[PDB]
Amino acid sequence: TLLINQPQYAWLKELGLREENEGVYNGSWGGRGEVITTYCPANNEPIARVRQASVADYEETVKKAREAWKIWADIPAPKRGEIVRQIGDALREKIQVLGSLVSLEMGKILVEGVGEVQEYVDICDYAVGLSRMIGGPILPSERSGHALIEQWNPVGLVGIITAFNFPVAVYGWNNAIAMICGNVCLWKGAPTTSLISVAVTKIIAKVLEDNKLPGAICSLTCGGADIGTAMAKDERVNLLSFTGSTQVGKQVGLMVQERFGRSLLELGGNNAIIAFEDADLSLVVPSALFAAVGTAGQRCTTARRLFIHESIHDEVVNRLKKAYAQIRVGNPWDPNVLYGPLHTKQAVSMFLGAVEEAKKEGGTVVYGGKVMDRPGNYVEPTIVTGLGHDASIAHTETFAPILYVFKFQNEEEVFAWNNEVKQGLSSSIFTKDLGRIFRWLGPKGSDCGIVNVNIPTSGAEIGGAFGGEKHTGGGRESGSDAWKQYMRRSTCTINYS
Amino acid sequence: TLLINQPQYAWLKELGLREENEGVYNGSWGGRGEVITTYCPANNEPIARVRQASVADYEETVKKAREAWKIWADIPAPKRGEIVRQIGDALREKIQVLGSLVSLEMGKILVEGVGEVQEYVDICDYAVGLSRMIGGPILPSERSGHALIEQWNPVGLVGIITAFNFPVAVYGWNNAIAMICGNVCLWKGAPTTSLISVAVTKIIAKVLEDNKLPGAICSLTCGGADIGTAMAKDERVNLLSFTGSTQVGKQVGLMVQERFGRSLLELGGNNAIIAFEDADLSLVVPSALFAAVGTAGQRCTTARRLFIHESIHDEVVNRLKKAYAQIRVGNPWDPNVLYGPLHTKQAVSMFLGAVEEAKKEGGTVVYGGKVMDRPGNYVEPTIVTGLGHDASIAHTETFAPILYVFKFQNEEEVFAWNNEVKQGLSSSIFTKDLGRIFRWLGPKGSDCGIVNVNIPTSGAEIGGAFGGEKHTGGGRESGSDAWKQYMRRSTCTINYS
Amino acid sequence: TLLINQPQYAWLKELGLREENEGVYNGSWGGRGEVITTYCPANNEPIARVRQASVADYEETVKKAREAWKIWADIPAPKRGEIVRQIGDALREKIQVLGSLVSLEMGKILVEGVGEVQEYVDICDYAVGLSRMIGGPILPSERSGHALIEQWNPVGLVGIITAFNFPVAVYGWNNAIAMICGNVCLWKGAPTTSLISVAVTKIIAKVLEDNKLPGAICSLTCGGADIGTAMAKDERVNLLSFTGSTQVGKQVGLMVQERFGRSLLELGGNNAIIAFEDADLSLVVPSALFAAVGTAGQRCTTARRLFIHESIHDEVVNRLKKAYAQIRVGNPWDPNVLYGPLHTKQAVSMFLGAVEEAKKEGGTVVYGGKVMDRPGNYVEPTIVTGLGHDASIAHTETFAPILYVFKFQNEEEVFAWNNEVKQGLSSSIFTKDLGRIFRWLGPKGSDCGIVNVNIPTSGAEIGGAFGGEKHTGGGRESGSDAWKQYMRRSTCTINYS
Amino acid sequence: STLLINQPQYAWLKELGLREENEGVYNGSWGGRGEVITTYCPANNEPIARVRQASVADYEETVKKAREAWKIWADIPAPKRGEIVRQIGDALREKIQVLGSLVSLEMGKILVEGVGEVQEYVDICDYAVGLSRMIGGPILPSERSGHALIEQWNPVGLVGIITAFNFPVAVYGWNNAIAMICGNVCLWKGAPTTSLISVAVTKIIAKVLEDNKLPGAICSLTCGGADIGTAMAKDERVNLLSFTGSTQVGKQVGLMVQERFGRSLLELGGNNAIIAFEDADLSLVVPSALFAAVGTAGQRCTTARRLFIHESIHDEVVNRLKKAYAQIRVGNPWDPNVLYGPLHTKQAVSMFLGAVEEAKKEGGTVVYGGKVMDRPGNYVEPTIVTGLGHDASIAHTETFAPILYVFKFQNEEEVFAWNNEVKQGLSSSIFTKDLGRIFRWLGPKGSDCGIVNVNIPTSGAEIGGAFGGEKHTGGGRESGSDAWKQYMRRSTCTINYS
Ligand SMILES: NC(=O)C1=CN([C@@H]2O[C@H](COP(=O)(O)OP(=O)(O)OC[C@H]3O[C@@H](n4cnc5c(N)ncnc54)[C@H](O)[C@@H]3O)[C@@H](O)[C@H]2O)C=CC1
Ligand SMILES: [Br-]
Ligand SMILES: [Br-]
Ligand SMILES: [Br-]
Ligand SMILES: [Br-]
Ligand SMILES: [Br-]
Ligand SMILES: [Br-]
Ligand SMILES: [Br-]
Ligand SMILES: [Br-]
Ligand SMILES: [Br-]
Ligand code: NA
Ligand code: NA
Ligand code: NA
Ligand code: NA
């Protein structure tokens, strides 16, 4: 009954997957913890099993990673960059099958599964150049006969805890950067995407082994909250990068603070699109559709709040309802499918709870609101009008395709309403007005980490730093000088005289 | 009875000080909380009194600072830099009397009191240029017809809690940089340096008033742990910069993380000098003396551990104990004095307690270890030989002039011994060996924030970022790109097509 | 009789000027060359005299400057910054009287004279901060046990040749930056602005001498083409910064290239404003007025071409003609005057010849075109319609207030017409269209060094690099990383193993 | 059978797409109506194959096609330009052994160095892919309310690239990779004696562009000599001219470009010194000096030509160097583990003999070498001369041959001055353990060169740094740090949005 044992899913064997897989890698493969079965959300059928990390496995892995670090930190950064280059190429070779796995086990559509792998490929290619650039200034000392230099060094072991919804790319952004920065990594992915974590780790492990390097440079310990908490409490984990809910992230951040560790937190979002009266509606409508319903509303950057100027509110709502009706639903790996399932049955329950709460708080479901009558975790993408901007349910992140729509009149009030929530990840305005655009980007504009114009809330690329403010946690990944979070600065005065 | 009422201390009135002073400034002066008297630690005489902040005063001041922010954040950064330029000149004008107040109330020697004010003047002058530079890159988007820009904006209200020992410079580094970055400030200084906080605030207030700017841009709420905890818990304080003990700093860090605020933590040190066999002993001996006994051992960067190669250990210790015997003791503001009192009686008790625990743990006091028989809080600067490098008292920061001396033989072990403690502020080696120097600066070298060569642990200048790692808390102040901690990054994609 | 000998000009003596002044400074004052008398362009009266540099003076000065460099280059950059801070304050003390001298000898209105001095003060203030920043990265070597550092060192002697029209500020930009970068300076200003060059040099000389530094760090050799040519040919002049005509600059550039020196060329402009149909005309008209007629048309950044969309051409021209008629003409020291004389009688002749050439080429003088019947070098500010955009006289820089007006229809053609001239200094569009703005800033936009939107061609500030492309010569001054032009880069690999 | 390409043992040449006669113009189309040149193997003086160079008409057509191509290329986002450069890196990777071998065959340097050049190009390509997501300027805080201030960088347009014989792949590669990601189109004129290498490289690039449906004139080739080079130097359509070559020609090129207010990037001659202090590790100094002086048969721009040795250690170092020189394996440069090949031309051999005689006239003593080797091809003995004054005319002159001039010194100040007294300013190296001396060398009273090295010879450089020299070396930089800015135009842009 396991999908991996069915002829049609034989392609899973191309990723080295079998009926039961080792979920611990530290140079050797193992797993003496609980065996987990993951399921395909499109049909609720079991795919395969992963043997998770026991406490002893965790302990052994940390020690081995730290031993490997002594070798790795001695390799020149440009040479570490060559390893990351080879990782990029290894990912390229497995792009279709790895993206197909993301669609199968996570449930996003194929083009996005593949796109996710491509993101990891792209950050590897970026990191190769960065590996010849990272460092600080040599500064002019006020003291005669002295040099003053800013040095950057690896922090050591970078733990990486990742969410279900970007089961490849988030790890990738962290890995590529942490690696070139001279750190070793320990990955604990989402339990419900354990096969993806295993598959990615196999690809990287082959590269490390082919280059005669210790595998524990990119260690894996599959597990749940138990392993995650161990990481958060472990003084040997010098930086903990955590991508996940604000509720869990808060606790991770506190645990890391308690031990004077470093954390990089990438937490929840409650992202707004705002359409002004001068907006190009031919642009607004598809943008909002994609931002709200893409990945079945399971992106951290998903649009969950849509503010529309009173003058165009009804036309936009009507056009969006028509667009929602045209959405092609089906198995996420099938041709021309744009809409797949929610990742879990619990997510379906949370969706229904949110819809009922929206109604009690005074909103009207104008499209959707129900579970679809078909196998898997499918729900109707949903549009709610009539809530106050400050409705409790609108201020909460429900990780499901529910879009709350609000009217507004003026720019000052709607910027404030963008900013009034506790989340601070992404935000977008649609307008042609030059001044309004630069005000949006300025100190009285959006308070979010991602501040977009005429592109929706999921608009981001490798070259920029990615993350948010407020309850989104403050960390940054990927581009700009995000790398500095994975290194320790020293200010060094050398008296040579 | 109060020093300010004696003709010889009439100069205090040049700083706007009176017998009883208001300790709250927000545009207006007040203070409804407890009245504190501060004392001269050289003679234990009372200087004057300060009316501290009640809860109502704090609430009033936060609200006024937040209102002022709306005005201040709209002022172009270069024009903010002009205000900072004027602050610099205003401090210049009062450098001698302000330096004298620092010597009187805090107890450091006049040249260091004056030097502290000069540090604030210097960071103001640096910040004037920086106000025309702060920002991020315009990056090449992968999307045709799109711009990608990294913007930086003020965080809002910067709370600044400072320690007794640098009662002007630490505030100054935070103020000058926070200001040019478009933030408003709220200062809560050490209670035992309340007159200094008031004096500095008077100087800045006049500049803001003369420029028709709201005074709450540089607010003051004198108080103790009550006010400081309020600040740590206040969601209205967007960034809390805290300089102080690790113990307190840990709790402040936790309170800020609980509310998803930002913290900048500048905590304790336990700084090592390491003298290799090829060291210039004519440089090591006076460097170690200054690093260990300067400010009566009350710098966060004070040398508390001295590792000496076995071949030269006895010669250095003997030469150092001769040097200690020559130190000139007196009132810290008096001519040619090099050594003043400890800041409080409690510090004397802690000094005595450490000296005795050092003995319980097996150390030998080879110079000092006694209180001095004279008015004020004077202790003998102390050298302890014989302890194991891992003696619990050597691993503890005792904020007094006790120098623990250790033998070593090889480089790798002594680098490990630098690094074994929980603190990570400053470190220094004295050697001529080129390879050893670059190894010290590299990934297997010092783990500290300040990594020095042939200059002691007290060596730093405004052009570099200042701060530590591990239990020192990770924050940076002053130079390089420390300004980024006082601002929020956004990554902005503009579809202009 | 000399104006300086009349009682109402006694304020000239506040600048230390006398009836005959030494025009050579190198630590000592002299000048054995020809004695020049300078004249006020508002009335053609002689002001005072300056003893210029002979060949022997020049030779002695270059030798003394290179000797001074030995000392200066050994002073830490931040301490050089301290000298520059003091120069800025010394300029502040004399801002009104120096500004008055600029109005008298050069002929621009008083607010611009004072503004010019303020520009030098402001670049000094900027440079103080930059003196703690200048340098390059420490880079990650691909070689184990090697360091890789980019160092920057002074070039040595920076010769600075300046134009008549910004007789303080151009020198200032070069001086402040060159100085903090560890260079010594040799100034030859415009002979018709000799008193200004002397006055500025007296201010700097006092700072250097007060600080017991050799005065040849900021040397002065007043003279004409002879001294300028010597500088261009002198291998001891490591960098020659030349601000002036394209014609002269081309020859300076070739002379410097022949000897493998460095040049920084800041040459002519032919700057266009373009007004699109969506422009705010209440903004276009006053911006075009200021940009065209400010400084009597004698800025390098003066608007000389105005392209107006066909829909709005006649209205814009009608509004400009009206605005020109309200210009207040007179003595540039009269506080209500907005328009003074051209700098020389030759300039009047060139103006007249350009006006008559414009007519011969088919243009219509719609406003002005005549020499004014009054004392001094006054001409009417002039507007010419009806020429083709590629009319010969329109492609020529005539350094006088003549604005050539053209119609256009589409964006692509008008961007091409901005770009078709040989000059490449400044450019401006007036529009509200977001896409057009970004395209203007992009690879198919303006080809100039200054690319402005909704602000005219004279829009620039010290934080940015200033200069142009094409026949404007390529050099940059003032902000961003313009400082690198005044230093030599080295790429340094250190094998420490 | 006369041509090496028609002999069976060199059939590997065809793996590069080379034939008996090859088109030496590429602009999307291949051609060449100019003079046919035959290039020769310096190891055996045999002709390899032929290349049809550019006529004036070819040049004109190619510049026009390049400028049309620029309109398309500059509109492609920089990261997508980066992706093309990535693919160029991979295409070079595929041909690395055979293109390296052609470098050894046509140019004459040993195989590890020919392979090494191709690897350098691969490596700068990989660097440029990251850089393509990074290039740009700051957004600055305007002093004006309601205004933005932005520093923008845009392509200059057409970058002409003239290269020398001695790095016939790597120098083009550094310029190409960077120019391309910066949105420029390129026009290459390589050394005539390395025409086959230019053709082979251009075939690799052409295939990548054409496979990606891009116009090939993005990376155009016009093989030729001084006539084509001069045209480029005079052409207003060539926005930046990057010239690598002799100081004598580079001066003229720089003057032509300046005359027309174009931009030049000049990478000219060197006269590079190694200085060994009394405290130097001799076990390091000797092999370093050997590699730096004799590597590439003395035909690197960064070749060590002057060796200053402290009086106390001079005789020992010279003796050890003479011993090491006698142990070098000589052979055909494309054979693995041969360490010493021929000079590039018969003319270069004659100039070597002339320089040795000049050294003797000026009072020097040849303590090793000085003669031609008794073997086929342009082989000369690597040569050590002692006894000259540091200011000897022939020591101040760049002779592109393996002649090392050795000098004694006593004091640091004097020997730093002697490093600096020549007109060239490319590379320099000291060997010492003294911390202060090392930082003084790096400081304002130290080396005046563009490359300033410590305990590694004069040929020590890597792609992450900017590469180039000062003084008569011409001032240009290639490869790393912010060298890219020379391939772009800066604009300072004020936007009033209020
Ligand atoms: N790009 C920029 O920053 C600026 C450019 N300019 C340009 O300057 C020109 C107006 O100023 P002018 O003083 O009339 O220019 P000019 O070219 O006649 O003279 C400029 C300076 O060069 C000197 N000089 C004259 N002949 C020389 C020679 N053969 N060799 C060396 N130096 C020589 C003059 O004495 C003077 O100091 C305009 O073209 C204007 O656009 C003016 C200000 C700024
Ligand atoms: Br998007
Ligand atoms: Br107020
Ligand atoms: Br110190
Ligand atoms: Br005339
Ligand atoms: Br303006
Ligand atoms: Br022809
Ligand atoms: Br032809
Ligand atoms: Br010859
Ligand atoms: Br090397
Ligand atoms: Na279902
Ligand atoms: Na006492
Ligand atoms: Na007149
Ligand atoms: Na031969």
DSSP A25-61: ESSSEE--S-EEEEEETTTTEEEEEEE---HHHHHHH
Provide the phi-psi class of C362: left if phi over 0, else alpha when psi is between -120 and 50, else beta.
left
Do residues A277 and A227 share a domain? no
3-class secondary structure per residue, B420-482: CCCCCCEEEEECCCHHHHHHHCCCCCCCCCEEEECCCCCCCCCCCEECCCHHHCCCCEECCCH
Q: Which two tokens stand for residue C51?
A: 């003893």
**b/e A291-306 (16+ beta carbons within 10 angstroms → b):** bbbbbbbbbbbbbbbb
Query: What is the distance between the alpha carbons of residues B25 and B219, in angstroms, rounded to a whole number?
Result: 5
Do residues C18 and C33 share a domain? yes
Do residues B100 and B221 share a domain? yes
Q: Hey, is the C-beta of A133 within 8 angstroms of any chain D C-beta?
A: yes
φ and ψ of B449, to 5 deg: -80, -25
Query: What is the distance between the alpha carbons of residues C403 and B225, in angstroms, rounded to a whole number?
Result: 69
CB-CB neighbors (< 8 A) of A489 in chain B: 449, 465, 476, 480
Domain of C106, in residue numbers: 5-268+462-497
- The CA distances from residue A258 to A488, B247, C428, in Å, are 19, 11, 56
Residue D309 lies in a domain: yes
Contact state of B148 with A493 under an 8 Å Cβ cutoff = no
- Let me know if C57 is exposed, middle or buried by CB neighbors in 10 A (0-12, 13-18, 19+): buried
Q: Which two tokens stand for residue B240?
A: 């809390």
Angle among Cα D361, D362, D364 to the nearest 5 degrees reads 95
Query: What is the distance between the alpha carbons of residues B313 and B317, in angstroms, rounded to a whole number?
Result: 6
Do residues C149 and C230 share a domain? yes
Do residues D178 and D48 share a domain? yes
Secondary structure of residue A137 in the 3-state scheme: strand
Query: What is the distance between the alpha carbons of residues A305 and A312, in angstroms, rounded to a whole number?
Result: 16
Q: Which amino acid is at A20?
A: E
Number of cross-chain residue pairs from A and D with Cβ atoms under 8 Å apart: 58
CATH (domain of C16): 3.40.605.10
Query: What is the distance between the alpha carbons of residues D298 and D303, in angstroms, rounded to a whole number?
Result: 6
Instruction: With CA atoms as reference, report the closest residue to A203 among A36, A84, A79.
Output: A84
Cα dihedral B16, B20, B24, B28, rounded to 10, equals -60
Contacts of D37 (CB under 8 A, 6+ apart): D24, D50, D51, D53, D192, D195, D223
Catalytic residues of A: 266, 300
Technique used? X-ray
Q: Which residue has the tokens 């003294």?
A: D434
Q: Which residue has the tokens 């007025």?
A: C289
- The CA distances from residue C268 to C246, C422, C426, C473, D202, in Å, are 5, 9, 10, 8, 40
- The CA distances from residue D61 to B417, D31, D33, D37, in Å, are 71, 11, 12, 21
- The CA distances from residue D225 to A142, C337, D36, D102, D191, in Å, are 52, 63, 12, 21, 7
- Let me know if D145 is exposed, middle or buried by CB neighbors in 10 A (0-12, 13-18, 19+): exposed
Q: How many CB atoms lie within 10 A of CB B383?
A: 26
Q: Hey, is the C-beta of A260 within 8 angstroms of any chain B C-beta?
A: yes
φ and ψ of A92, to 5 deg: -55, -40
Strands in C162-253 per DSSP E: 184-188, 218-221, 239-243
How close is the nearest chain B Cα to the Cα of D493, in Å?
12
Query: What is the distance between the alpha carbons of residues C324 and B399, in angstroms, rounded to a whole number?
Result: 73
Q: Hey, is the C-beta of A125 within 8 angstroms of any chain D C-beta?
A: yes
Residue D1 lies in a domain: no
DSSP β-ladder status, D25-26 and D219-222: antiparallel
DSSP B24-56: EESSSEE--S-EEEEEETTTTEEEEEEEPPPHH
Instruction: With CA atoms as reference, report the closest residue to C471 among C191, C297, C271.
Output: C271
Residue D64 lies in a domain: yes
- The CA distances from residue B311 to B277, B314, B317, B410, D301, in Å, are 6, 8, 12, 11, 48
Q: First CA to last CA across chain D, in angstroms?
A: 77
Q: Which amino acid is at B283?
A: L
Do residues A356 and A230 share a domain? no
Resolution of the determined structure in angstroms stands at 1.3
Do residues B260 and B274 share a domain? no
DSSP A143-185: STTEEEEEEEEE-SEEEEE--SSSTTHHHHHHHHHHHHTT-EE
Query: What is the distance between the alpha carbons of residues D93 and D81, in angstroms, rounded to a whole number?
Result: 19
Q: Which two tokens stand for residue B26?
A: 């927000």
Cα dihedral A381, A387, A393, A399, rounded to 10, equals 20
Number of domains in chain B: 2
Query: What is the distance between the alpha carbons of residues B300 and C377, in angstroms, rounded to a whole number?
Result: 68
Query: What is the distance between the alpha carbons of residues B382 and B367, in angstroms, rounded to a whole number?
Result: 5
Query: What is the distance between the alpha carbons of residues D455 and D486, in angstroms, rounded to a whole number?
Result: 30
Do residues D301 and D162 share a domain? no
Spatial contact of B4 and B13, defined as CB atoms under 8 Å apart? yes
Q: Which residue has the tokens 């841009």?
A: B217
Compare all CA atoms of chain B with the CA of A246 and give the residue at the minimum distance. B260
The alpha carbon of D397 and the centre of ligand 9 are apart by a number of angstroms equal to 12
Q: Which two tokens stand for residue A59?
A: 């302990």
Catalytic residue among B105, B300, B411, B448: B300
Query: What is the distance between the alpha carbons of residues C288 and C315, in angstroms, rounded to a whole number?
Result: 13
Query: What is the distance between the alpha carbons of residues A201 and A222, in angstroms, rounded to a whole number?
Result: 11
Is A457 labelled as part of a ligand binding site? Answer: no
Q: How many CB atoms lie within 10 A of CB A345?
A: 14
Query: What is the distance between the alpha carbons of residues A404 and A418, in angstroms, rounded to a whole number?
Result: 13
Spatial contact of A150 and A141, defined as CB atoms under 8 Å apart? no
- The CA distances from residue A387 to A358, A361, A397, B226, C121, in Å, are 7, 7, 15, 41, 57
Q: Which two tokens stand for residue B96?
A: 């001698």
Do residues C233 and C299 share a domain? no
- The CA distances from residue C366 to B94, C314, C383, C398, C452, in Å, are 62, 11, 6, 18, 27
- The CA distances from residue B271 to B282, B292, B307, B397, D169, in Å, are 21, 10, 11, 9, 52
Helix axes C246-258, C225-233, angle to 10 degrees: 30
Query: What is the distance between the alpha carbons of residues D310 and D285, in angstroms, rounded to a whole number?
Result: 12
Strands in B175-280 per DSSP E: 184-188, 218-221, 239-243, 262-266, 271-275
Do residues B304 and B314 share a domain? yes
Mutate which of C58, C105, C119, C165 for ligand 1 pocket (most atoms within 8 A of beta carbon): C165
CB-CB neighbors (< 8 A) of B78 in chain C: 461, 463
Instruction: With CA atoms as reference, report the closest residue to B124 among B71, B162, B178.
Output: B178
Angle among Cα C469, C470, C471 to the nearest 5 degrees reads 115
User: CA neighbours within 13 Å on the CB side: how many for D115?
Assistant: 11
Query: What is the distance between the alpha carbons of residues C479 and C130, in angstroms, rounded to a whole number?
Result: 10
Provide the phi-psi class of C27: left if phi over 0, else alpha when psi is between -120 and 50, else beta.
left
Query: What is the distance between the alpha carbons of residues B162 and B300, in angstroms, rounded to a whole number?
Result: 12
Instruction: Give bridge partners of residue D152 from the DSSP assignment.
Output: D491
Query: What is the distance between the alpha carbons of residues D294 and B92, in angstroms, rounded to a whole number?
Result: 62
3-class secondary structure per residue, chain D: CCCHHHCHHHHHHHHHCCCCEEECEECCCEECCCCEEEEEECCCCEEEEEEECCCHHHHHHHHHHHHHHHHHHCCCCHHHHHHHHHHHHHHHHHCHHHHHHHHHHHHCCCHHHHHHHHHHHHHHHHHHHHHCCCCCCEEECCCCCCEEEEEEEEECCEEEEECCCCCCCHHHHHHHHHHHHCCCEEEEECCHHHHHHHHHHHHHHHHHHHHCCCCHHHEEEECCCHHHHHHHHHCCCCCEEEEECCHHHHHHHHHHHHHCCCEEEEECCCCEEEEECCCCCHHHHHHHHHHHHHHHHHCCCCCEEEEEEECCCHHHHHHHHHHHHCCCCECCCCCCCCCECCCCCHHHHHHHHHHHHHHHHCCCEEEECCCECCCCCCCECCEEEECCCCCCHHHHCCCCCCEEEEEEECCHHHHHHHHHCCCCCCEEEEECCCHHHHHHHCCCCCCCCCEEEECCCCCCCCCCCEECCCHHHCCCCEECCCHHHHHEEEEEEEEECC
Spatial contact of B428 and B444, defined as CB atoms under 8 Å apart? no
Angle among Cα C5, C6, C7 to the nearest 5 degrees reads 120
The alpha carbon of C266 and the centre of ligand 1 are apart by a number of angstroms equal to 9
- The CA distances from residue C213 to C30, C182, C198, C207, C209, in Å, are 19, 13, 19, 9, 6
Query: What is the distance between the alpha carbons of residues B98 and B117, in angstroms, rounded to a whole number?
Result: 7
Do residues C81 and C161 share a domain? yes
- The CA distances from residue D105 to C326, D12, D40, D221, D346, in Å, are 78, 11, 9, 21, 15
Q: Which two tokens stand for residue C148?
A: 């890789």
Mutate which of C102, C245, C402 for ligand 1 pocket (most atoms within 8 A of beta carbon): C245
Instruction: With CA atoms as reference, report the closest residue to C236 among C159, C301, C163, C180.
Output: C159
Q: How many CB atoms lie within 10 A of CB C74?
A: 14
DSSP β-ladder status, C402-408 and C303-309: parallel
Spatial contact of D416 and D389, defined as CB atoms under 8 Å apart? no
Angle among Cα B158, B159, B165 to the nearest 5 degrees reads 125
CA C12: distance to chain centroid? 24
Compare all CA atoms of chain C with the CA of D155 and give the residue at the minimum distance. C443
- Let me know if B212 is exposed, middle or buried by CB neighbors in 10 A (0-12, 13-18, 19+): exposed
Query: What is the distance between the alpha carbons of residues B440 and B417, in angstroms, rounded to a whole number?
Result: 13
CATH (domain of C439): 3.40.309.10
The alpha carbon of B193 and the centre of ligand 12 are apart by a number of angstroms equal to 20
Do residues A55 and A172 share a domain? yes
Compare all CA atoms of chain C with the CA of D266 and give the residue at the minimum distance. C260
The single-letter DSSP state of residue B243 is E
Query: What is the distance between the alpha carbons of residues B284 and A421, in angstroms, rounded to a whole number?
Result: 57
Query: What is the distance between the alpha carbons of residues B232 and B240, in angstroms, rounded to a whole number?
Result: 7
Q: Which two tokens stand for residue B251?
A: 């709790």
Longest dimension (CA), chain A: 80
Angle among Cα D231, D235, D240 to the nearest 5 degrees reads 110
